[model samples]
Target: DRDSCVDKSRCAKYGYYQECQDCCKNAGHNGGTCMFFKCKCA
Candidate 1:
């Protein structure tokens, strides 16, 4: 689900910024798998 953000609208739905940021530590906050504000399949 590369486009999961669209489904939940990202942080607005989950509101787990910490967890999401940890998951994308290596990634960045620029959308896609690197987006630190949403869920991306690792």
Candidate 2:
């Protein structure tokens, strides 16, 4: 279920930009962007 969803908490405010991308990417997702200070992956 790695593609189902990602941990928003992590990519939300990880104190960095890449962290957000990494959060979802690390989880095996293509959601490599943040929306309104949160991870917006589809």
Task: Give the per-residue lDDT of model 2 (tens digit) for 1-42.
Answer: 543334444444423356545656766665465445555554
Q: How close is every model to the real structure, measured as TM-score?
A: 0.27, 0.38
Q: Which stretches of candidate 2 lie over 4 Å from their true place?
A: 1-16
lDDT of 1 by residue, 1-42 (tens): 324343343563234444444534444454333244545433
Candidates' lDDT values, in order? Answer: 0.42, 0.50
Query: Which has the greatest lDDT?
Result: 2
RMSD of each: 7.2, 4.7
* lDDT for model 2: 0.50
